[PDB]
Amino acid sequence: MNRRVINPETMYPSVPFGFSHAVEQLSGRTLHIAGQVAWNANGELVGGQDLLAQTQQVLANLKEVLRYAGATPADVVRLRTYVVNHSPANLAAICAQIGAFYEGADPAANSFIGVQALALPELLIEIEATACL
Amino acid sequence: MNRRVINPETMYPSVPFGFSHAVEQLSGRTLHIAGQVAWNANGELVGGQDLLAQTQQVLANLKEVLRYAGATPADVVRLRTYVVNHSPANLAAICAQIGAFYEGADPAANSFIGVQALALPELLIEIEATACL
Amino acid sequence: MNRRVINPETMYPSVPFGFSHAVEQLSGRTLHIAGQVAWNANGELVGGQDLLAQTQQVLANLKEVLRYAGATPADVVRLRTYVVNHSPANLAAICAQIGAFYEGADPAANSFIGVQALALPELLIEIEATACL
Numbered sequence: 001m002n003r004r005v006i007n008p009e010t011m012y013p014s015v016p017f018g019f020s021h022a023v024e025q026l027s028g029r030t031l032h033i034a035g036q037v038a039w040n041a042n043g044e045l046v047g048g049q050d051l052l053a054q055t056q057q058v059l060a061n062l063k064e065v066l067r068y069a070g071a072t073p074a075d076v077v078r079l080r081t082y083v084v085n086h087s088p089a090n091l092a093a094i095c096a097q098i099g100a101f102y103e104g105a106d107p108a109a110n111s112f113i114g115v116q117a118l119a120l121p122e123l124l125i126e127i128e129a130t131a132c133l
Numbered sequence: 134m135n136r137r138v139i140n141p142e143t144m145y146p147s148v149p150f151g152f153s154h155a156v157e158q159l160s161g162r163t164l165h166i167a168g169q170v171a172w173n174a175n176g177e178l179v180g181g182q183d184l185l186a187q188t189q190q191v192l193a194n195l196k197e198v199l200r201y202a203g204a205t206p207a208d209v210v211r212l213r214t215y216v217v218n219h220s221p222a223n224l225a226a227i228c229a230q231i232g233a234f235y236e237g238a239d240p241a242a243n244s245f246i247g248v249q250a251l252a253l254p255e256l257l258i259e260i261e262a263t264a265c266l
Numbered sequence: 267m268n269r270r271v272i273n274p275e276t277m278y279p280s281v282p283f284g285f286s287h288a289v290e291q292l293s294g295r296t297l298h299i300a301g302q303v304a305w306n307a308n309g310e311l312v313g314g315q316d317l318l319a320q321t322q323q324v325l326a327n328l329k330e331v332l333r334y335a336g337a338t339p340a341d342v343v344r345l346r347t348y349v350v351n352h353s354p355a356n357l358a359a360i361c362a363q364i365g366a367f368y369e370g371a372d373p374a375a376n377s378f379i380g381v382q383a384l385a386l387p388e389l390l391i392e393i394e395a396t397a398c399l
Contacts, residue, residue: 006331006334008331010307011330012305012307012309013309014300021302021331022297022298022300022335024297024298024335024399025295025296026295028159028294029157029158030157030158031139031155031156031157032156032157032158032210032241032242032263033242034147034152034211034242034244035242035244040145041143042145043145064143064144065139065141065154065155068141077298078298082246086382086385088387109298111300111301111346112385113246113301113381114383114385115247115248115249115381116219116247116248117247118246118247119150119219119221119224119245121221126244128244130298133157161292161294162291162292163291163343164290165288165290165291165343165375166287166288167286167287167288167376167377168377168379174278197274197276197277198272198277198287198288201274201288213377215377215379246379249352250380251378251380252352252354253354253357259379261375266290
């Protein structure tokens with residue numbers, strides 16, 4: 001509909017990792033969503049020190065900001081994933097969760113970055129998104 | 134005018150932190166500004182090893198690139214903030230400075246990332262921006 | 267053609283570093299390319315533990331995704347560069363390689379971020395791109 005996904009035969013398969021190599025955006029209106037973080041609406045921390053749990057709250061927050069603006073995850077054109085003290089042992093789970101975030105749609109482009117810190121120590125993952133309308 | 138800001142009632146309040154949860158861009162022309170850095174026009178370092186001081190130079194540089202392209206900070210649709218050896222004790226100041234960067238406009242979306250290094254050791258903060266026209 | 271580059275006289279010269287301070291995108295169709303990584307089409311690692319070598323594979327991958335979508339590097343509006351355990355001694359080489367990636371076109375905007383890790387330990391550099399059509 002709004003976007004078209006590009007996964008070249010000449011490239012390694014990315015969708016097992018929960019992303020597409022590129023998304024073409026043909027629509028004009030773009031929505032830029034700030035980096036989301038494992039906070040509820042009172043700014044309380046969802047998940048404790050479990051990355052997997054925090055990752056769910058982030059996705060939920062993304063989905064909610066999307067909804068509020070009139071979009072769904074299928075409208076997402078690009079993700080960026082920022083993880084604190086990243087360990088390859090959590091990678092599978094994170095890919096699974098981002099893959100599931102698209103609720104069956106082709107996955108957007110992603111970048112997976114292991115950072116040193118987020119805004120506050122309690123924060124373990126941040127995901128930002130771009131979508132079209 | 135060019136952009137519309139989105140801050141859901143169902144989300145924690147972001148504008149105290151100097152960003153909005155999402156910016157809708159309705160214009161067609163987008164301006165992509167490279168990560169700015171605490172350098173003056175001779176590539177000399179403004180600020181010494183004070184993050185706060187370097188952060189001012191970066192904002193100034195952003196504002197200047199904006200001006201040169203025909204835009205203002207109110208036109209900014211998204212920021213990304215990269216901080217070296219980030220400590221939560223500087224967070225308040227950084228939010229204050231980015232908040233003030235919009236000169237009264239609703240703040241754009243931001244992501245706050247604590248990185249390991251920038252291009253050179255002397256560099257302590259980098260902020261990139263996207264805006265519309 | 268598709269994009270216009272902006273390098274203010276009032277700013278330090280960026281093109282020696284292989285980027286422009288800002289790119290104006292006048293076209294409507296945007297292409298978002300996921301962070302590319304030193305993998306061939308079988309997901310095998312190109313480059314071993316040499317950053318320079320891995321950096322070539324990444325650029326090649328970017329160029330290929332571009333080609334597949336119908337674009338060239340001259341169409342690139344913005345790069346983001348993520349480097350693991352970055353050392354300023356590799357900076358010159360990386361700038362040279364990104365500079366050459368545009369095959370003579372004015373270089374896009376870039377951000378150079380020294381990260382803690384990528385998706386897997388073997389990975390040493392990741393570059394994502396945005397382009398227009």
